[PDB]
């Protein structure tokens, strides 16, 4: 995935071949591990973009993306 | 292909039956307010005492 930013915050452009794998990227505050559980398809015009909240010792609820060290934005296409 | 089921219809039913005569019941049996015509004979009755 391509690591960029959105208003100072880290942003992940996730491609199709990353479905099912732990997303890791270094940050001043250590290594960040986001988990993507998404309709994740091929990167195209039909993108969706939203935030993966920070979750410390809390079970996830009503979400398919979350990181454990620093909240991150994520973007991926839905095409197939 | 995805397949989803509608939600309970108990509600759609309830607020759909409003108006129709409600019938009481108990022990699984239905109850009504009946009307009877009877004929009786007392030739086998007698005063006690």
């Amino acid at each position: 995935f391509h690591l960029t930013t959105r208003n100072g915050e880290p942003h992940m452009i996730v491609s199709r071949q990353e479905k099912g794998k732990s997303l890791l990227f270094k940050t001043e505050d250590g290594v960040n591990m986001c988990t993507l559980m998404a309709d994740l398809g091929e990167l195209c015009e039909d993108t969706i973009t939203y935030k993966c909240p920070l979750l410390r010792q809390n079970e996830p609820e009503d979400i398919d993306c979350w990181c454990n060290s620093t909240s991150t934005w994520v973007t991926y296409g839905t095409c197939t | 292909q995805d397949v989803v089921v509608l939600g309970s219809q108990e509600g759609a039913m309830h607020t759909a039956l409003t108006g129709a005569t409600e019938i009481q019941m108990s022990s699984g049996n239905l109850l009504f307010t009946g009307h009877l015509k009877c004929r009786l004979r007392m030739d086998k009755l007698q005063l006690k005492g």
Binding site: - | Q9, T33, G34, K37
Partner: protein, 99 residues
């Protein structure tokens, strides 16, 4: 006392002896019968119920789905099938989709 306390109370008496006397019974009412040298009786219809009436049809109003399975064939190779399509506990649909 029950019958005396009721507002709807009929008094019936036989105009003959050994004859039949007619009375009408209704819910919430009572009938008092009298006859020469016979005790006076009170009659009340208290319950009217249907016992084990024939069940016409059972309607399901809430359900769940499990083991959803899909099968599909390429253009030119006829209609696909699933054996569970013969199992009366399943709901199935046939369609066409781009391939």
């Amino acid at each position: 006392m029950r019958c005396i306390g009721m507002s709807n109370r009929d008094f019936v008496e036989g105009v003959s002896g050994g004859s039949w006397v007619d009375i009408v019974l209704e819910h919430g009412s009572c009938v008092t019968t009298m006859a020469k040298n016979k005790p006076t009786l009170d009659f009340e219809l208290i319950k009217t119920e249907a016992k084990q009436p024939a069940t016409l049809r059972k309607y399901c109003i809430e359900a769940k789905l499990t083991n959803t399975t899909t099968e599909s064939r390429c253009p030119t190779q006829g209609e696909p099938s699933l054996n569970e399509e013969q199992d009366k506990r399943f709901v199935c649909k046939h369609s066409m989709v781009d391939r």
